[PDB]
């Protein structure tokens, strides 16, 4: 086993892992952070997305040893310490942007980075900007609304309707 030290949701983490352990499974199985999900075996769905050193990463397509020294945020790290939900978590509820909730951790983690990349995206920019994340339930329409809601909350002003 390999010795790794990293930061997850702002807390130091030290662990021993096999090299072949996928990051998704280190997160779910060893760290018990079971919000991130697996939806495929070919890297298409994005259910496993985490924010890693300022990047949206499909954690089923990376080994835990590759994340040595990294800073990771998972869905469990998004709410405020006072309990209050993040702008995106709130927008997903207000706009009915989830049903079964399986894609939702990955969708919110990708969207968190999208709004840092582009704080005021158009509808086309949103749709393209979450192209790596599949949903079976929503037909995406309300997810675009959720992300628009979160952007307007963060920015203090609305953009598109």
């Amino acid at each position: 086993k390999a010795h790794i030290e990293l930061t997850i949701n702002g807390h130091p983490v030290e662990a021993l892992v096999e090299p072949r352990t996928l990051l998704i499974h280190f997160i779910r199985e060893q760290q018990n952070l079971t919000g991130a999900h697996i939806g495929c075996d070919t890297s298409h769905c994005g259910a496993c997305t985490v924010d890693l050193d300022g990047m949206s990463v499909k954690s089923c397509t990376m080994f835990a040893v590759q994340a040595n020294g990294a800073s990771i945020t998972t869905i469990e790290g998004m709410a405020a310490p006072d309990g209050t939900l993040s702008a995106l978590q709130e927008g997903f509820r207000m706009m009915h942007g989830l049903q079964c909730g399986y894609c939702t951790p990955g969708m919110i983690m990708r969207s968190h980075r999208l709004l840092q990349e582009n704080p005021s995206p158009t509808e086309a920019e949103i749709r393209f900007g979450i192209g790596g994340n599949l949903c079976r339930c929503t037909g995406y329409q309300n997810i675009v609304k959720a992300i628009q809601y979160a952007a307007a909350k963060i920015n203090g002003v609305p953009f598109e309707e």
Binding site: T34, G101, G139
Partner: protein, 804 residues
């Protein structure tokens, strides 16, 4: 405010009709849902399968020795471990059996051959690679149109002698069943003599429900107690309990089935899979828990397919467009084992709703099922038990009849709609439709999209194509549909002998909050939110003061699960009826306290007042405390009720869907310009939730009509069964949806509500496919078979000479 108005009190309830925000979203947006693979138990092991590389082969032997010797491997099961058992085959909901682990032969590629149980999923995967299987290949059957030829391959050796299956006589070794309904002789006489006969063969190609969470379970036999706990992706957990009791011989009180949060189902998670059976056997043997979680490739290629119907469909008419009869024959490809979920008496589901929204005096339907070397299924993917196929058959047939009559297809529908006054309407294949106002909805759709103008625009674009000014063509897709949802009456709806009722139990606490449970099981449809809304309105208790649960068979009342868009028709009814029992008891309590007759009380949102004396009242909260604190002498203490609801009929929601599609004839690339969907599901519980169900269903319909497929080559290889090829749209491809409604209540339902969840897929696929076929009609393409992806539409134009 201390003394709120009646309107204010009603608003606070967040009851029926409100866009109540979902209670589920709090945990799901924070990663605190509890789905099967989130479960961790002491000592828990991981199991997974060695699967068949062959479509059709005898197994000469299996060598498990290298797998068993690997450190961290605890068991490797083959058919030989199960066959002493009689668990080498399992019963299906269709009345056939399916192989659990392959015994003498394999019958489809990726079929389960051995089950390895190890320390974790990484060791299990290593060990599966070490198993060696020796095959003797056999001639493969994949073309159902050749399945009953004299030299077709003998698939089901295990039932070679059994000329009567679960649904009547079998006419050939690869025949499963023949099922018919309607007036054969009258339909034939009508066709023999009709002015116009319009005939096509429409194929509804094989696709797959592909929920984002695959099928999985954690089995835990407690060998100290003799009790099995089974966590799993079950749309019908009580049905799974009863089945596991039958199979295992453990009694139902000692089998604790738990369906926790489920990451989508879409029909994939109704029946039992080999993985569940093998996890349970392994845990019984080893006495420790066993988790099984399939990967995507296995999900797509080995669990319930959808569709695969070849529908020879005919309409008889007058030249002026009156429809005189419908005659349909279906060749149904069921794969290797008939595992098609359905009520037991309906081997082609409710395909006999295929006369659709039209008034015709006579019709006939026949279906033949056949075995082929493929995965099992059929009923899945928002079908409502083959209603997807029924609607496609009729809505396509309306279009090809309209082309032959040289009539506008909207006018043809209008000329033949069942009229509002004719409901309840007995259709000519036996279903009695409950209510409908089809002219109003069709008119609203036509007004919204500017139909008459669109036809003029299309005519101009066609002229421009002929002048050489464009290579784009325009199609206008219409789908006017009648659904049938809410299975169903005890007379003829049952799942392996259990009548298709559903149920609700509601318990009010001394302080006025509520625990309520139902026999259904959500996989994202918002039940934990919407059942509370029905209760809130009935009882005047805010929805936030009500906790809804489903899925734990120890605690929820028995029900038949969630499929067939049945939850609202069945458990929704039961919830209202149970709540009404509580209200009736509360009224009795109020009358006793207020010292008046019951008939002198009136209800005002959340309280009973004395008629003429509104200052004399008792609130539901007060009555709930009274029922524990000062029970009236003739009444039991407390305040609770149960209802098990046997529906009198199905509910028959409807819709009017219109699509505008532009197509480049040189690349075959089609692009949706506009999609409008009007749904009428009677009284609306939560418009926000309905809208999301529609957006999801329409997106599936898009996917199915325009690109999705599971295919088999002549060698029996399964093709396209991964997200490398299987068309699951991203936000970029998915059209923007416009939605609308009318309200035509079900007269027989306690709150007038019909199901809706599958309507958007049922009606959407014919709408997309009709728009594509319509675009090419002026070029005489004929019926274009789905899917309508770019190479296939290119091919249509190639054969018409458009690329010369």
């Amino acid at each position: 405010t201390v003394e709120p108005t009646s309107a204010e009190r009603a608003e606070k309830l967040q009851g029926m009709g409100c866009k109540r925000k979902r209670v589920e979203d709090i945990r799901f947006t924070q990663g605190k849902g509890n789905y099967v693979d989130d479960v961790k138990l002491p000592g828990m092991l991981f199991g997974d399968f060695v699967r068949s590389s062959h479509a059709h082969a005898r197994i000469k032997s299996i060598d498990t020795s290298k797998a068993k010797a690997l450190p961290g491997v605890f068991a490797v099961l083959t058919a030989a471990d199960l066959k002493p058992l009689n668990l080498h085959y399992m019963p299906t909901l269709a009345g056939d059996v399916q192989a659990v682990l392959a015994d003498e032969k394999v019958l489809f590629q990726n079929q389960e051959v051995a089950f390895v149980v190890a320390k974790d999923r990484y060791v299990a995967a290593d060990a599966i690679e070490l198993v060696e299987v020796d095959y003797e290949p056999l001639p493969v059957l994949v073309d159902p149109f050749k399945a009953m030829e004299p030299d077709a391959p003998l698939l089901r050796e295990d039932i070679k002698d059994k000329m009567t299956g679960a649904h009547g006589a079998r006419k050939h070794h690869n025949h499963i069943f023949r099922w018919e309904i309607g007036d054969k002789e009258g339909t034939d006489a009508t066709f023999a003599k009709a002015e116009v006969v319009s005939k096509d063969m429409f194929t509804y190609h094989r696709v797959h429900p592909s929920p984002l969470e695959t099928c999985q379970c954690v089995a835990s036999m407690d060998k100290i107690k003799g009790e099995l706990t089974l966590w799993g992706t079950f749309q019908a957990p009580h049905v799974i309990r009863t089945v596991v009791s039958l199979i295992s011989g453990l009694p139902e009180h000692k089998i604790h089935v738990i369906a926790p949060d489920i990451g989508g189902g879409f029909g994939n998670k109704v029946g039992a899979y080999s993985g569940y059976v093998c996890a349970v056997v392994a845990s019984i043997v080893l006495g420790v828990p066993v988790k099984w979680v399939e990967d995507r490739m296995e999900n797509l290629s080995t669990t319930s397919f959808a569709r695969d119907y070849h529908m020879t469909t005919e309409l008889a008419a007058t030249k002026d467009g009156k429809i005189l009869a419908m005659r349909c024959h279906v060749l149904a490809d069921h794969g290797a084992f008939d595992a098609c979920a359905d009520p037991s008496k309906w081997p082609a589901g409710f395909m006999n709703i295929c006369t659709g929204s039209y008034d015709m005096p006579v019709a006939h339907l026949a279906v033949d099922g056949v075995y082929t070397n493929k995965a099992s299924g059929g009923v899945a993917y928002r079908c409502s038990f083959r209603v997807t196929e029924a609607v496609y058959a009729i809505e396509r047939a309306i279009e090809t009849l309209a082309q032959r009559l040289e009539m506008d297809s909207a006018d043809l529908r209008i000329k033949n709609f069942i009229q509002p006054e004719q409901f309840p309407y007995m259709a000519p294949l036996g279903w009695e439709y409950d209510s409908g106002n089809y002219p109003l909805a069709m008119k609203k759709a036509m007004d919204t999209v500017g139909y008459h103008q669109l036809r003029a625009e299309q005519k101009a674009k066609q002229e421009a194509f002929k002048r050489g000014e464009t290579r784009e063509i325009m199609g206008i897709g219409i789908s006017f549909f009648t659904e049938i949802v809410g299975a169903g009456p005890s007379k003829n709806c049952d799942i392996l002998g259990v009548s298709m009722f559903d149920s609700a139990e509601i318990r009010i606490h001394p302080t006025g909050s509520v625990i309520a449970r139902m026999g259904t099981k959500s996989q994202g449809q918002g039940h934990e939110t919407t059942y509370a809304q029905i209760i809130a309105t009935e009882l005047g208790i805010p929805a936030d003061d009500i906790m809804i649960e489903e899925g734990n068979t120890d605690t929820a009342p028995y029900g038949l699960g969630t499929y067939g868009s049945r939850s609202t028709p069945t458990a929704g009814a039961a919830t209202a009826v149970a709540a009404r029992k509580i209200k009736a008891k509360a009224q009795m309590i109020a009358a006793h306290m207020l010292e008046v007759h019951e008939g002198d009380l009136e209800w005002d949102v959340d309280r009973f007042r004395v008629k003429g004396l509104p200052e004399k009242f008792k609130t539901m909260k007060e009555l709930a405390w009274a029922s524990y604190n000062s029970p009236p002498p003739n009444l039991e203490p407390g305040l609770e009720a149960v209802n098990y609801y046997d529906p009198p009929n199905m509910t028959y929601p409807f819709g009017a869907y219109f699509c505008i599609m532009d197509i480049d004839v040189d690349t075959g690339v089609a692009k949706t310009r506009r999609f409008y969907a009007l749904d009428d599901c009677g009284t609306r519980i939560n418009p926000m939730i309905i809208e999301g169900q529609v957006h999801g269903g329409l997106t599936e319909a898009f996917a199915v009509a325009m690109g999705q497929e599971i295919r088999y080559d002549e060698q029996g290889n399964v093709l396209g069964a991964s997200f490398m090829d299987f068309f699951l749209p991203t936000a970029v491809e998915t059209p923007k949806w416009e939605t609308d409604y009318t309200v035509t209540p079900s007269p027989h339902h306690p709150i007038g509500a019909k199901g809706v969840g599958e309507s958007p897929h049922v009606g959407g696929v014919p709408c997309f496919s009709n728009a594509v076929n319509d675009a090419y009609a002026f070029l005489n393409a004929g019926h274009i078979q789905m899917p309508h992806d770019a190479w296939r539409l290119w091919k249509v134009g190639e054969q018409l000479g458009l690329h010369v």
